[PDB]
A paper describes a structure:
The cryo-EM structure of [name]-[name] in complex with a poly(A) [name] composed of 90 adenosines and three [name] protomers shows how the oligomerization interfaces of [name] are recognized by conserved features of the deadenylase and thread the [name] substrate into the nuclease active site. The resulting 3D reconstruction reached an overall nominal resolution of 4.8 Å. [name]-[name] has essentially the same structure in the 90A [name]-bound state compared to the substrate-free state. The 90A [name] forms a long tubular structure that zigzags on the surface of [name]-[name]. Here, the conserved N-terminal edge of RRM1 packs against the conserved C-terminal α-helix of [name]. The position of RRM1-RRM2 orients the 3′ end of the RNA at the entrance of the deadenylase cavity, which is shaped by conserved residues of the RNase and UCH-like domains. The [name] linker helix contacts a conserved surface of the Pan3straight pseudokinase domain, approaching the ATP-binding site. At the oligomerization interface between the first and second [name], the [name] density adopts a sharp V-shaped turn. At the oligomerization interface between the second and third [name], the [name] interacts with the WD40 domain of [name] at a conserved surface of the base of the β-propeller. The linker helix that extends from RRM4 of one [name] protomer interacts with RRM1 of the adjacent one, including a segment of the sequence preceding the RRM1 fold (referred to as leader sequence).
The stability of eukaryotic mRNAs is dependent on a ribonucleoprotein ([name]) complex of poly(A)-binding proteins (PABPC1/[name]) organized on the poly(A) tail. This poly(A) [name] not only protects mRNAs from premature degradation but also stimulates the [name]-[name] deadenylase complex to catalyze the first step of poly(A) tail shortening. Indeed, the cytoplasmic PABP interacts with and stimulates [name]-[name], the deadenylase complex that trims long poly(A) tails (Uchida et al., 2004). Briefly, [name] wraps around an intertwined homodimer formed by two [name] protomers (Christie et al., 2013, Jonas et al., 2014, Schäfer et al., 2014, Wahle and Stubbs, 2014).
Numbering used by the authors:
A (entry chain A): 87 to 172
B (entry chain A): 345 to 395, 411 to 582, 593 to 681, 692 to 858
C (entry chain H): 35 to 428
D (entry chain O): 224 to 453, 467 to 683
E (entry chain N): 225 to 231, 251 to 301, 307 to 462, 466 to 680
F (entry chain D): 288 to 427
RNA sequence: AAAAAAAAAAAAAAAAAAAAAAAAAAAAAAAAAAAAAAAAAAAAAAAAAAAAAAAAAAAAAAAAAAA
């Protein structure tokens, strides 16, 4: 789940694995949508930001912390990918 | 929600003895449970335990049969929820043991950072007329510098003696004050006699009992802002105490010591204020109580207590730049508001006197950070009055300020040593200048131990047993 | 003090614990059967174990059934209490060798049970009963084994001695067939000068392996090839002069000693060539080669080399076919350039050459089995989801 | 119903005593707080020994014998192998009483209840430590047929001393301490049979001498009808024969328990005075005691005086040992009681602490009384050290728990939570405050 | 699952009726210390502190003291009258003579010191505090109540004093005047009476301890036989006398009366042999305790009977007390880190935070509402859950706010893992 | 030849330097928490140095007595140090349930100073109690 | 006119090379060839080879005061 501020990930049980805010960088300040990363499908996300750091980021969900960041300036309404596209 | 709940009938909430705490509980496990207790020392049984600000509506909103009292101070009764260290009279049995025999105690260098080197230890007692006996000192010093004797009720200002002997402004001032009679200036004259005795003794041992008794008998002759300094002062008696070296005592002692020095300076036969201007920070302190019913006052406060509010990178110069110019608020009641007066207060030192004191009062987190920050403190910094603040850079090339770049070199400080044996004592570090060779040296002074150490060892704060508290920057030319 | 926990070795995969239960159910106290399907792919370790509540019925099932055919293979049922200690001691199966090729663990067990209950008995009884004439027999312990040594070292048993004195390697029934006085792997010394005679092949060589037969090998061409066959005493001295007299001086000239007609009792020459091929077989590329599958049939090494001519120094263009007939998809160009191969990862991966797309991956027969492991994973996964679906579908 | 241990350092783990090798008297520990492991595991093994049953029937044996149900056998090392054994654990109607029941079947020439009745009352009137309660004797038609049942108490850890030293797994022997302890226990029970005017009975020599208690026990169960199930001075002469037999036996078995080697018993025609004069690690005074315990030649029923006419000091040292064991037993029992009191105390503590609606501000106080309650909680539980790291010291906590558990009038200073609103408070007030809060929340009639 | 419902006199003679209540009252006597003593000696004197007194004339020289070096309740005696101890040689000699003195009823010499803290000089010694120190004359006659004494207790106390005799005479020394009833101290509902004073204060004043070979300690042995005899005789005649109240009948060496020692009220011939062995202090006897114990000859077994019977009763009641230490360490781990003020309001402890439901179940047990919404304990359910969470087994757990939020259905071993992880992270970095 | 005749460690704990230095060693041993682990089952296909550099990415072995029987027969055992208990946990979770040839490379803590024989004792006791119970039920 | 699907899920498969008797070859100098747990199962820390440990560092103080 993703709110305006909190990005939560529970397990299918309902038990909590992760939940973060914009932790020490302004990651989860402005939140738009979810993706997945080009290493696997039902795996770590590439979460859509617009100007929260004006760079879109992947976060390794299954280690607890960062995957990647990148500098795309413009605002994004919506995001999709099949396997390795953006 | 498993049905191992066919019966649990009686609410047996507490203290029933028709069923005791012998468990009728668990299903039969297989492995280790939660109570695996990790090893610990548990070394704090029996270490002699002991015993304006209005109450805010952090707690007043739920007060009934109330008795609060907003009176807790951090320097007064220490760290919140802290546990004191253990030092029983087996350490007094170590005081019964000898200090050193047939070697040099002057090893100021341990291989481990945790171990206290032998030079930072207690030196043994000075046995007087014992049976055909006396105590001797000639291995402890080989230089020509006079020593002290800790058999005096300060326990503290012996380092302040070795400190303020080494300020030529202060020294030449008071030895100028000595040549007149000045029968009213007690501490000024007697401090001057003490420093002149240490001067012309040339390595000969000294004591402070004249000035100890003079300071004491003055502070015995008691019942203003002097008295407001004195209202917490005299709680030193009956020396049994959890703090021998205490949090806030030598700081206030140096504070009102220099205050009384400038009072007796102001009541000489010549009435100079040369130390007052020379040492005083021009603190325009602006107690902005009301918009109208408030105060602005320029006080020429010679020292700088480091409250340490947020420590406002890691090193000392931005923290001093915070301490010069800083605003905050306060809930002290001013009468124009009647209720809890949400007053504010800003502080701005307007000068840069050639000698800068630094008295520390902060939490041990930042002390351990100084233990991590190598060369945390600054050896020689250059400062200048930019518009509302003394910017204190290393050189002027960082920022020249708006007013008259000076040249401020550290002379020394007072090191509290809280050793492995849980003994808290004081050691002077100083850097005596030589004009004959235009060089410097870092004299370590324990009570009568006199050596020279290196600068970076004197700058080394990484030891857990070593803590600076009272720091005297001078001007480099005035050094 | 375990009641019974017993070794059952030299198995075959037909013998399940159902069949072991059908064997040992009239023994009397069936506790459990630890079939040692080792956790790689349920394989046996060469053995299993049967646990019995009764110590006496376990001793019974041993002494009745030791090399008896359970489903057609003789049961090597012994003790293994000290056998993990023999594992993490290095000891265990000692080399009572030159055994009989027609006598199994049962007959020699009941024979030398007067020397002791053989706690680790094996002969070379593979191949559903055939012994090669040796094995690793070892008794209870050092005392009973040393009693068998000092009592029986060189006795007669169907016209054959035993040898536990030396750790005698394999092929021991055919040991004297190896030791036959006619055949022997000679030593070809290459590029010999004509000064070396039949006398000269025995002078400095009889110390490195005794020589009676010394033949200056002239060929069927009248001359010397320069290659002379040194006829030592044993193939180990063929070893000693292929790796000690290599380019040595007999008098003044070379001794490039190769093994003239190896008789296979010393071996593994150029098997490292195999591992040299492991530089380029399953780890195929070394970022150089290109397994390019799914060409056209008109794309021969012709059109493959034509496409890869901009892609570096072509060293091996090669398409395997149905006996140089029908290729079923795949070719290879070993390059000499890795960065042009990266340019092909860009370009010639996802590439039409003629009409059907190129397919690029590093070439291995290794992880076909790992892909089958993933097939097992997904098979058990769909089995699990179908089990949950049929469970909760009501 | 399943076989498992749950004691593989699992009930509470073992702790490294290498830190305890270099440790200060200020430095206490959790075992020094609570209990050493051995007594705990011994008592839990005793508890499971009492209840070695998981709910089943066991109807293949007869299961109810005259309001004694759950006949379950003492199979420790039961000397009735390849035979339906006779010594069971059974539960009475009254106390559910844990009993050893021993039933002797197939009797014909003992039909008089008067013989077993006089052996009953003659040995129910006896009373000693090692004189296990002789009870409940009658022939029955169950346990086969004509089973004369007798009843002793259950008394776990069947440790007939060959068990306690040679079947024993760590292999510890008995040195001179348990020597004199067993000496005064046997001297006690032979004084008891000289008092109650009966024989030595039947059993000795690692038979019926199962050590139930801790500090060294005889607990000789069978001194009963050897042959007369169906003079007395000669019997109280051959008591010395049995006794010096066991004493020569274990006095040479010390030399065999030097190693881990199971001994054999060394009956009367092995008692030789050269072996008396030549065995090792034996007191020569105790050798002269066995020289007297060269068996009773002059057939008077000799009392224990001529035995004890060599010594009385070591009997006092045995009494010393017994007093030492009782004293530090009472010490660790005081530790266990104060732990139980403080556990009920912290049950009362966190009973009302932590309401969901209270956790709003920094301090989690809702109403008037709750902040002066949870005033304490920081310097009681959340004790960061002097250096500044948040840790736990179990001995500052327990001295606090001592000082608060009474509720004395002595006050204490605290800073909570802003380090401005200081406080001092006395502890009876805290006690009454928690009580009034407990009635304010768990009023237990309406709230 | 793993368990069900589970677990005057003659020879036992040690039967307190509410016995754990008695022991916690004894420890309650060990507890408090009145801080406002007003003594000119402060708390912190010579490695000891919190000096609170006892009853007057050993109005002091009986000080309950919690220790600095040990941390243990001790008794102190002042000797507030002597002022001269010119030789530390003899002080060290006394340190040898009593630091090696080792027994049970001889309470162990800890240390001595001549302070200047009362105003005066005073050779204060310390021993071990025992709770509720009384004499037998206190236990019956001086203090309420008066238990009717049998001969059995007289045999017991006889065994105690012969133990003391064996102890100090193994130490080839003697006592002096301590065998008045007042200068001894019983140790509770059993006798087990532990003497304290041992009359060695004269040894600080002159030098007569086995060097005077007149030794003179054999004369002190016969003297203590006489003190022993008058002690037991006053005990006997006062027990017959104060069946209700007629206490005391204070008799001396002058009032020894071997006539009426033999013409006593209820003492048998074996007791009469005992007191006649005591009272006939003749020449050159140096009376054998082996002979007098041969006169005794039975009571050693009776006090072993009472000892092991009381012991087995102690573990029989100790059976249902043991489930505390694991439980108390559970609470240690539990409330060690629950509401730390840095972690009271932070990111990783909110409903969006990391260690969120470790709070939730915490007070779920502690504030489980009733059908009327009242949070009512029902400690059965509490300890059920406590042992289950202590275990680490895999269960399924409904949890509510009450309303429709933050519901998580969970098992235990992960809660175990996060608890130990948080505890270790707190413990150091 | 400067023939350096070595001395084995015979000097132990006379000055304060081993007393305070072993106090620091005990302070280290309060902070190791099972660093040097007993390597069990040195398998056939895993050598000493093969082990020592398979786990060189997973711990710093300050004391490496990983051998075979003078590299003759197998030891089957050695000692390999780790970093921290949670690094021990990840070393558990990564190298688990892998048969190399027949025995798993089980590098873990050291125990069984009796407790194998305590287990075998209580198992024999359980077998005795269950064996009389099953003999009783079978004899019905 | 032996003329085969031109590869899912980064599948999956080439090797990048030899005893040389080509001619008149004897019997292990190998350096070692050396498999067994799995009923809740195998378990050194200190720091790890004394192939040369002299090992009481004199002492003495007739004693204070200071009317
Ligand atoms: Mg004089």
């Amino acid at each position: 789940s993703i709110s305006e501020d909190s990005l939560h990930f529970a397990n299918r049980r309902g038990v909590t694995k992760l939940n973060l805010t914009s932790i020490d960088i302004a990651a989860f300040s402005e939140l738009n949508t979810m993706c997945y990363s080009p290493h696997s499908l039902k795996n770590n996300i590439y979460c859509g930001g617009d100007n929260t750091n004006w760079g879109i980021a992947s976060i390794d969900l299954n280690r607890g912390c960062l995957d990647s960041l990148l500098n795309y300036s413009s605002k994004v309404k919506l995001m999709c990918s099949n396997n390795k596209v953006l | 929600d498993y049905f191992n709940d066919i019966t649990s009938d009686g609410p047996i909430s507490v203290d029933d003895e028709t069923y005791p705490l012998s468990s009728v509980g668990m299903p039969y496990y297989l492995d280790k449970l939660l109570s695996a207790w990790p090893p610990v020392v548990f070394k704090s049984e029996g270490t002699i335990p002991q015993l304006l600000a209005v109450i805010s509506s952090q707690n007043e909103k739920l007060s009934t049969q109330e008795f609060p009292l907003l009176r807790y101070d951090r320097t007064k009764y220490g760290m919140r929820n802290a546990i004191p260290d253990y030092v029983c009279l087996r350490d007094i049995r170590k005081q019964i043991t000898s200090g050193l025999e047939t070697s040099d105690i002057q090893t100021y260098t341990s291989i481990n950072k945790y171990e206290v080197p032998p030079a930072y230890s207690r030196l043994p007692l000075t046995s007087g007329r014992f049976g055909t006996d006396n105590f001797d000192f000639t291995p402890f010093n080989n230089t020509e510098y006079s020593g002290l004797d800790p058999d005096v009720d300060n326990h503290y200002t012996n380092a302040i003696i070795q400190l303020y002997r080494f300020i030529p402004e202060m020294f030449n001032f008071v030895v100028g004050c000595l040549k007149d009679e000045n029968f009213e200036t007690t501490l000024l004259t007697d401090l001057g006699y003490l420093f002149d005795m240490m001067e012309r003794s040339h390595g000969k041992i000294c004591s402070s009992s004249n000035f100890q008794a003079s300071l004491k008998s003055l502070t015995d002759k008691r019942q203003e802002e002097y008295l407001e300094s004195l209202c917490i002062r005299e709680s030193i008696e009956d020396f049994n105490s959890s703090e021998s070296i205490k949090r806030n005592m030598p700081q206030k002692f140096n504070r009102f010591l220099l205050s009384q020095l400038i009072k007796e300076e102001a009541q000489t036969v010549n009435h100079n204020i040369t130390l007052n201007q020379c040492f005083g920070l021009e603190t325009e302190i602006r107690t902005e109580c009301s918009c109208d019913h408030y105060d602005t006052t320029v006080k020429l406060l010679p020292s700088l207590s480091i409250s340490g509010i947020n420590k406002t990178g890691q090193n000392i110069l931005p923290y001093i730049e915070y301490a010069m110019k800083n605003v905050t608020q306060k809930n002290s009641i001013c009468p124009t508001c009647g209720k809890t007066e949400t007053i504010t207060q800003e502080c701005t030192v307007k000068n840069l006197p050639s000698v800068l004191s630094l008295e520390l009062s902060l939490l041990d987190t930042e002390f351990s950070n100084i233990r991590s920050s190598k060369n945390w403190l600054t050896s020689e910094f250059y400062g200048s009055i930019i518009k509302n603040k003394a910017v204190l850079r290393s050189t002027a090339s960082e920022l020249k300020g708006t007013s008259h770049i000076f040249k401020y070199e550290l002379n020394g400080y007072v090191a509290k040593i809280t050793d492995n044996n849980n003994e808290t004592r004081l050691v002077t570090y100083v850097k005596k200048y030589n004009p004959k060779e235009n060089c410097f040296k870092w004299l370590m002074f324990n009570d009568y131990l006199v050596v020279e150490i290196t600068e970076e060892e004197a700058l080394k704060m990484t030891y857990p047993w070593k803590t600076p508290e009272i720091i005297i920057y001078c001007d480099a030319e005035e050094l | 003090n375990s009641s019974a926990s017993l070794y059952v070795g030299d198995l075959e995969p037909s013998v399940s614990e159902a069949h072991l239960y059908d064997i040992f159910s009239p023994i009397g106290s069936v506790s459990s059967i630890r079939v040692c399907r080792d956790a790689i792919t349920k394989t046996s370790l060469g053995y299993a174990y049967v646990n019995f509540n009764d110590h006496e019925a376990g001793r019974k099932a041993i002494e009745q059934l030791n090399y008896t055919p359970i489903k057609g293979r003789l049961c090597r049922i012994m003790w293994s209490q000290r056998d993990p200690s023999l594992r993490k001691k290095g000891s265990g199966n000692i080399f009572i060798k030159n055994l009989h090729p027609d006598i199994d663990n049962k007959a020699l067990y009941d024979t030398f049970s007067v020397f002791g209950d053989i706690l680790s008995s094996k002969i070379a009884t593979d191949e559903n009963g055939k012994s090669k004439g040796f094995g690793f027999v070892h008794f209870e312990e050092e005392g009973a084994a040393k009693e068998a040594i000092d009592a029986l070292n060189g006795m007669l048993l169907n016209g054959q001695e035993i040898y536990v004195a030396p750790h005698l390697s394999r092929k021991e029934r055919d040991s004297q067939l190896e030791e036959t006085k006619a055949h022997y792997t000679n030593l070809y010394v290459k590029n010999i000068n004509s000064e070396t005679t039949d006398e000269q092949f025995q002078e400095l060589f009889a110390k490195f392996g005794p020589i009676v037969s010394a033949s200056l090998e002239k060929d069927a061409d009248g001359k010397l090839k320069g290659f002379g066959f040194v006829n030592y005493e044993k193939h180990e001295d063929a070893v000693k002069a292929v790796e000690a007299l290599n380019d040595s001086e007999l008098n003044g000239e070379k001794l490039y000693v190769g093994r003239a007609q190896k008789k296979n009792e010393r071996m593994h020459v150029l098997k490292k060539q195999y591992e040299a091929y492991r530089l380029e077989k399953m780890a195929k590329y070394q970022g150089v080669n290109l397994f390019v599958k799914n060409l056209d049939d008109s794309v021969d090494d012709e059109k493959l080399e034509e496409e890869f001519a901009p892609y570096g120094t072509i060293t091996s263009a090669k398409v395997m076919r149905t006996e140089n007939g029908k290729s079923k998809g795949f070719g290879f160009v070993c390059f000499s350039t890795p960065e042009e191969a990266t340019k092909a990862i860009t370009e010639k991966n996802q590439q039409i050459v003629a009409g059907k797309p190129l397919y690029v991956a590093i070439a291995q027969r290794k992880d076909v089995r790992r892909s089958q492991l993933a097939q097992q994973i997904q098979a058990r996964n769909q089995m699990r989801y179908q089990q949950a679906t049929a469970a909760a579908a009501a | 119903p399943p076989h498992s241990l749950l004691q593989y350092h699992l009930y509470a783990p073992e702790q490294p005593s290498s830190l305890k090798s270099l440790l200060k008297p200020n430095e206490r520990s959790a075992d020094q707080l609570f209990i050493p492991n051995n007594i705990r595991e011994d008592l839990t093994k005793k508890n499971l020994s009492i209840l070695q049953v998981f709910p089943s029937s066991g109807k293949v044996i007869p299961s109810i014998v005259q309001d004694y149900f759950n006949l379950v056998p003492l199979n420790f090392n039961n000397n009735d192998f390849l035979n339906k054994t006779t010594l069971f654990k059974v539960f009475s109607n009254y106390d559910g009483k844990a009993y050893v029941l021993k039933r002797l079947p197939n009797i014909d020439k003992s039909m008089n209840p008067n013989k077993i009745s006089k052996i009953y009352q003659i040995w129910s009137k006896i009373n000693c430590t090692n004189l296990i309660k002789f009870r409940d004797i009658f022939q029955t038609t169950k346990f086969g047929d004509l089973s004369i049942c007798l009843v002793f108490d259950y008394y776990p850890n069947s440790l007939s001393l060959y068990d306690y030293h040679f079947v024993n797994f760590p292999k510890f022997p008995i040195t001179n301490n348990y020597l004199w302890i067993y000496l005064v226990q046997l001297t006690n029970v032979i004084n008891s049979i000289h008092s109650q005017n009966l024989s030595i009975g039947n059993t000795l020599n690692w038979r019926k001498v199962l050590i139930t208690g801790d500090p060294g026990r005889i607990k000789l169960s069978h001194c009963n009808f050897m042959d007369l199930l169906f003079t007395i001075e000669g019997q109280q002469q051959l008591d010395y024969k049995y006794l010096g037999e066991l004493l020569f036996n274990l006095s040479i078995n010390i030399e065999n328990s030097n190693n881990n080697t199971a001994p054999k018993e060394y009956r009367l025609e092995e008692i030789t005075p050269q072996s008396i004069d030549d065995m090792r690690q034996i007191d020569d005074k105790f050798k002269d005691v066995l020289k007297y315990l060269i068996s009773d030649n002059g057939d008077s029923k000799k009392s224990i005086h001529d035995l004890t006419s060599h010594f009385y000091d070591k009997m006092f040292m045995v009494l010393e040992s017994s007093q030492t064991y009782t004293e530090y037993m009472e010490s660790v029992l005081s530790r266990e009681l104060e732990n139980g009191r403080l556990f009920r105390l912290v049950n009362k503590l966190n009973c009302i602490f932590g309401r969901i609606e209270s956790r709003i501000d920094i301090n989690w106080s809702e109403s008037g009384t709750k902040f002066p309650i949870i005033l304490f909680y920081d310097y009681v539980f959340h004790q960061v050290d002097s250096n500044g790291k948040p840790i736990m010291d179990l001995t500052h906590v327990l001295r606090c728990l001592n000082k608060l558990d009474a509720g004395i009038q002595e006050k204490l200073m605290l800073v909570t939570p802003d380090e401005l609103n200081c406080i001092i408070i006395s502890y009876k007030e805290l006690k009454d405050l928690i009580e009034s809060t407990f009635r304010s929340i768990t009023q237990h009639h309406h709230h």
